[PDB]
Amino acid sequence: MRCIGISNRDFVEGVSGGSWVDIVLEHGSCVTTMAKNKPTLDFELIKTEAKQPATLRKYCIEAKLTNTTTESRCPTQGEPSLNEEQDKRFICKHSMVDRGWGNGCGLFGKGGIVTCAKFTCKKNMEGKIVQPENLEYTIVITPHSGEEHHGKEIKITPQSSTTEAELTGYGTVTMECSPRTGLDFNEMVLLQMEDKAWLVHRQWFLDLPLPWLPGADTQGSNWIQKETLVTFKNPHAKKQDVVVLGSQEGAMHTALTGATEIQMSSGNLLFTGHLKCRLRMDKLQLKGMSYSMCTGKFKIVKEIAETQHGTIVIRVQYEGDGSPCKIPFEIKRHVLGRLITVNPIVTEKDSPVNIEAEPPFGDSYIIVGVEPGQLKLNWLRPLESR
Amino acid sequence: SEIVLTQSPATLSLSPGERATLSCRASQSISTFLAWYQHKPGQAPRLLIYDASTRATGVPARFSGSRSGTDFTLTISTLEPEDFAVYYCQQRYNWPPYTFGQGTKVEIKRTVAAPSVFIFPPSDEQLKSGTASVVCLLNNFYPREAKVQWKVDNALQNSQESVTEQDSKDSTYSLSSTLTLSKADYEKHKVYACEVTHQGLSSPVTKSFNRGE
Amino acid sequence: VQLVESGGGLVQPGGSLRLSCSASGFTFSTYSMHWVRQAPGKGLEYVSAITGEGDSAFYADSVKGRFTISRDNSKNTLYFEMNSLRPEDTAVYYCVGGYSNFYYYYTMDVWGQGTTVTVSSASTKGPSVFPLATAALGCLVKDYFPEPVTVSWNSGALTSGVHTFPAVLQSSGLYSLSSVVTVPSSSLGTQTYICNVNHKPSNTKVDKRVE
Ligand SMILES: *[C@@H]1O[C@H](CO[C@@H]2O[C@@H](C)[C@@H](O)[C@@H](O)[C@@H]2O)[C@@H](O[C@@H]2O[C@H](CO)[C@@H](O[C@@H]3O[C@H](CO[C@H]4O[C@H](CO)[C@@H](O)[C@H](O)[C@@H]4O)[C@@H](O)[C@H](O[C@H]4O[C@H](CO)[C@@H](O)[C@H](O)[C@@H]4O)[C@@H]3O)[C@H](O)[C@H]2NC(C)=O)[C@H](O)[C@H]1NC(C)=O
């Protein structure tokens, strides 16, 4: 019943005889399945998750230099040194400055200088290696029970592709899903930047000129290639300057245009995955196929409304007393349109039922219940121009 | 355009066991997107019905909801004592604001009872402060509607009134009327009277005192 | 499944305040959260709403500009960082939440208990208690701020026939109320009557004999 209202919806019907029915599930797409004397079911891919992801390398895209420290020596007094030169969180550089009387030296000449600053990462992106088989999918199966828009969650993986799922009152449904997504995780790296994510070529990833931490480094601070975001300036032999090179965030986004983008709605992998499944409905059964026909009268609780796919939704309440019972439903004298919410049943007189049916093109008659007060509603499904 | 919900009546006076019918009118069709709440003072508002006719979780069956275009109805079949509260309707149509009705108060219908009236002069203690407060008490009356006016040396009057919530067990109300004057203005007059007008009283009841007691 | 609100209090006009609403018993991210207020003696006013993800916010004109709704899904908390407070924003503020699958829309909700916000310029002041000497007697509890005040009789021993009237705001900006009791005329000579008034905001505790 979940599909009712979703524009990206498919109505897949099982080939007259054959138990199997092939469907394609993707994010923001719903699928309605029908088969002769079988319940109508609604499928939706709710989440895709990359499990057991091995971090290959982590890159710095925005950095900050702090704790700047300098040491100089007087001319001929050798090379200066700071302890920081041995601290791997620090970026250092040796240069020469003009020394003399006015800057604290007995002699006039080129005195060695050394400038150290603490390289701190403000923003990073991590590249993850994901094993195709480790991609978990979450499918929700909702039966067409007439009850408000109840659903059995089911998890599959390209390995555990085939699962039997039991639906309370309808029996079991066998699902055989394919390891055939539009995703070659082989030689691809899942590049994650905050809330954005993409799938990119391994060699391109490793060849990026940015400071990095290896996959192995357990939340380290010893960024390799710090030089790629740091610059030392000493043009007049008066002073050495250390300067940060500015956020590569937007630059990265631009580099990543001709890449497979992955979206992250509510901080999860909710894109580029599509699952081609096969469905066996031989163990499925219509709920209340044993119940008797409704005798009483029906009321129209909400005005009949048309869905985006030409189908119509009728919310009705039972006034009679036979419940639990089968609702008599039909769409002059000869049958015309088809039912989507197959074998509509009443559970309680108080609880209304939602019946989805496909009316025929043009004028039709929606007849709900049996006499007296048997509802004889009118529909108009006009034809469409190019 | 802005959706306004109109609730009628403002107050509904009934007896336990009766059927209550409350209406809510939308300024435009809001389809079926209408909710009903029960609000007791010193309690958070409680959702009863949503989608015009759907009973919320645990809500008893005596509560019923129905629609007819822009006109919505809340029905309570067998009124019980704990159903005596304030009822609000709320629109959940389309996009916010999900505005409310002005509310309907469901009150206990009881036999008419005239107010027993008392007048209190300012305390000796208070006058020392340069201000005088004269209080009039209207005790245990029904219906709620009452009028009290102050007369100083017979000249109609500087007063504020406050009413209690309907009594939990006898279903009556009580009212305080406070007359405030400077000790100076208080001392330049002699007779202080409170005249009460109520349904249960054939003619106005007056209670007075003389400042020279 | 609950919502606990906090941060209510006395604030001066033109002033500012921040309200909190801690959510428990559900996936906070799956609920559109809302702020509903009720001024004393007025009805419920739907004031603001925020998406389950924090993405988008709605504000009723009555608050649009001065009030900012926000939320922390890690800390399961809704906020009504309310600045530029005026006396008309004096009300009980409730947070409400409902499972939402589309922006701010919901069906079944959850309500907190409310938090009182008082926007006033008046200073905290204790009441002056005067006696109001079947017979009827009482106490006049005049010129206190803010609410509430509690009145009992003979230290809770006298309950039957007691009517403590709701407080009324004077033009002074201070509250005043009366608490009364009806007793047999015969008991006036045999029983002492003392009202026990307590205005906790000003540390005022007063016992007055009505005779
Ligand atoms: C590099 O410089 C660091 C500071 O850098 C400057 O400020 C920042 C903002 C830069 O962007 C830049 O502009 C400047 O260069 C300097 O940091 C200092 O390090 C010590 C620890 O070694 C910190 O001490 C700990 O402080 C916390 C609480 O202090 C906070 O105060 C305010 C309010 O939150 C913030 O402004 C501060 O940043 C702090 O976060 C204490 O709780 C803590 O006590 C416990 O731990 C120590 C061990 O460190 C124990 O001995 C104690 O007994 C306690 O159990 C520390 O006292 C200090 O806050 C921090 N200063 C600042 C201003 O950040 C650091 O020394 C330099 N780093 C290197 C590698 O040289």
Q: d(Cα B14, Cα B84) in Å, to the nearest integer?
A: 9
Ligand 1 proximity of A66 Cβ (cutoff 6 Å): yes
Beta carbon of A67 within 6 Å of any ligand 1 atom: yes
In chain B, domain spans: 1-110, 111-213
3-state secondary structure of A178: coil
If you count DSSP H runs as helices and E runs as strands, how many of each does chain C have, helices first? 0, 19
Using alpha carbons, select from A195, A310, A276, A270 the residue that is nearest to residue A28: A270
Give the chains touching B; criterion: ≥3 Cβ pairs < 8 Å.
Answer: A, C
Rounded to the nearest angstrom, the minimum Cα separation between A8 and chain B is: 21
Asked if A198 and A101 sit in the same domain, the reply is no
Q: Which element (helix H / strand E) includes A253?
A: helix A249-255
- Given C74, C95, C121, the domain boundary residue is C121
Q: Of the candidates B211, B176, B129, which has an alpha carbon nearest to the alpha carbon of residue C143?
A: B129
Q: How would you class A346 by CB atoms within 10 Å of its CB: exposed for 0-12, middle for 13-18, buried for 19 or more?
A: buried
Distance CA B50, CA B74 (A): 11
Using alpha carbons, select from A185, A149, A166 the residue that is nearest to residue A48: A185
* C-alpha to C-alpha distances, A80 to A91, C159, C171, nearest whole angstrom: 15, 88, 78
Question: What are phi and psi for residue C139, nearest 5 degrees?
Answer: -135, 140
Peptide bond into A372 cis (omega under 30): yes
- Annotate C115-146 with DSSP letters as a single string: EEEEE--PPPBPPEEEEE--EEEEEEEEEEBS
Cβ burial B181-206 (10 Å sphere, 16+ → b, else e): beeeebeeeeebbbbbebeeeeeebe
**C18 backbone dihedrals φ, ψ, rounded to 5°:** -125, 125
In DSSP terms, A114 is beta-bridged to A71, A94
Q: Which domain holds residue A332?
A: 287-386
All residues of chain A having their beta carbon less than 8 Å from the beta carbon of residue B32 are 302
- Residues of chain C contacting B50 with CB distance shorter than 8 Å: 107-108
Q: Are residues A110 and A6 in the same domain?
A: no
Q: Name residue C205's beta-bridge partners.
A: C198
Spatial contact of C98 and B42, defined as CB atoms under 8 Å apart: no
A214 and A87, same domain (yes or no): no
Q: Report d(CA A316, CA A346) in Å as an integer.
A: 10
Residues A299 and A381 in one domain: yes
Tell me, using a 6 A CB cutoff, whether residue A83 lines ligand 1.
Answer: no
Helices (H), chain C: none
Indicate if C39 and C88 belong to the same structural domain: yes
- Tell whether A315 and A205 lie within a shared domain: no
**Cβ proximity of A247 and A62 under 8 Å:** yes
Non-local (6+) Cβ contacts of C64 within 8 A are none
What is d(CA B75, CA B10) in angstroms, rounded to the nearest whole number?
16
To the nearest 10°, report the CA torsion of A98, A101, A107, A111: -30
- CATH code, domain with A320: 2.60.40.350
Tokens representing B27?
A: 């300024």
CB of A68 closer than 6 angstroms to any ligand 1 atom: no
d(CA B148, CA B136): 9
Same domain, C8 and C95: yes
For this entry, resolution in Å reads: 3.0
Q: Which of A28, A73, A32, A3 is nearest to A274 (CA)?
A: A28
- Smallest CA separation from ligand 1 atom 3, residue: A67
Q: Please give the C-alpha separations between residue B121 and each of A254, B180, C165, in angstroms, as whole numbers.
A: 85, 11, 18
Residue A229 DSSP SS3: helix
| Amino acid occupying residue A233 | K
Tell which residue, C58, C36, C30, C59, has the closest CA to residue C111: C36
* Residue in the structure block whose two tokens are 């008659």: A365
Experimental method: X-ray
Could you tell me if C74 and C137 lie in one domain? Answer: no
Q: Which of A292, A300, A365, A368 is nearest to A328 (CA)?
A: A368
Show the tokens assigned to B41: 């003072």
Class of domain B1-110: mainly beta
Please, are residues B158 and B150 in contact by the beta-carbon 8 Å criterion?
A: yes
**Alpha-carbon A326 to chain mean position:** 39
Do the beta carbons of residue C43 and residue C28 sit within 8 Å? Answer: no
φ, ψ for residue A254, nearest 5 deg: -65, -40
C190 burial level (CB within 10 Å; 0-12, 13-18, 19+): exposed
Residues C133 and C88 in one domain: no
- How many Cα atoms within 13 Å fall on the side-chain side of residue B113? 19
d(CA B104, CA B14): 13
CATH code for the domain in which residue C6 is found: 2.60.40.10
Pairing of strands C194-199, C204-209: antiparallel
Check: CB of residue B3 under 8 Å from CB of residue B99. Answer: yes
What residue owns the CA closest to ligand 1's atom 7? A66
Start-to-end C-alpha separation, chain A: 30
C-alpha of residue C187 to centroid of ligand 1, in Å: 74
Distance CA B158, CA B194 (A): 13
Q: How many residues does chain C have?
A: 211
Are residues C17 and C115 located together in one domain of the fold? yes
Domain that holds residue C193: 122-211
What is the Å distance from ligand 1's center to A66 Cα? 12
A352 and A205 belong to one structural domain: no
Report whether the peptide linkage leading into residue B143 is cis, meaning its omega lies within 30 degrees of zero.
yes
The residues near A293 (Cβ < 8 Å, ≥ 6 apart) are: A322, A325, A326, A328, A370
- On the question of a common fold for B1-110 and B111-213, the answer reads yes
Please name the residue that has the structure tokens 């089968």.
Answer: A326
Are residue A334 and residue A266 in the same domain, yes or no?
no
Domain CATH code at residue A70: 3.30.387.10
- Pocket test of ligand 1: the residue of A64, A65, A67, A92 to mutate, having most ligand atoms within 8 Å of its CB, is A67
DSSP state of B164: P
Distance in angstroms (rounded) separating the CA atoms of residues A355 and A377: 14
Coil/strand/helix, residue A255:
helix
Which residues does chain A have within 8 Å of residue B31's beta carbon, measured at their own beta carbons?
A: 302
Under DSSP, the state recorded for A179 is S
Structural domain count, chain C: 2
Task: Specify the number of domains making up chain A.
Answer: 4
**Residue A158: is it exposed, middle or buried by C-beta count within 10 angstroms (0-12/13-18/19+)?**
buried
The single residue listed with the structure tokens 């539009």 is: A182
Q: Please answer whether residues B136 and B118 qualify as being in contact, where contact means their C-beta atoms are separated by less than 8 angstroms.
A: yes
Report the distance separating Cα C165 and Cα B178, nearest Å.
11
Cis omega before residue C148 (within 30°)? yes
Tokens of A373: 């007060």
Q: Which residues precede gaps in chain A, with C-N > 2.5 A?
A: 149, 331
Cβ pair B178:C180 closer than 8 A: no
Contact C180 B139 (CB under 8 A): yes
Nearest-neighbour CA in chain B from C168: distance (Å): 7
Cα A255 from Cα A263, distance rounded (Å): 17
**Residue of chain A whose Cα is closest to the Cα of B61:** A350
Interface residue of B31, B50, B53, B66 to substitute, partner A, most A CBs within 10 Å = B53
Q: What is the CATH number of domain B111-213?
A: 2.60.40.10
Size of interface A-B (CB pairs under 8 A): 6
The answer, for B105 touching chain C at a CB cutoff of 8 Å, is no
Cα separation, A336 vs A364, whole angstroms? 8
Look up tokens 């309500």; give the residue.
C111
The last residue of a domain, from among C121, C139, C174: C121
Could you give the CA distance from residue A138 to residue A156 in angstroms, rounded to a whole number?
7
AA letter at C165: F
Q: What angle do CA B113, B118, B124 make, to 5 degrees?
A: 165
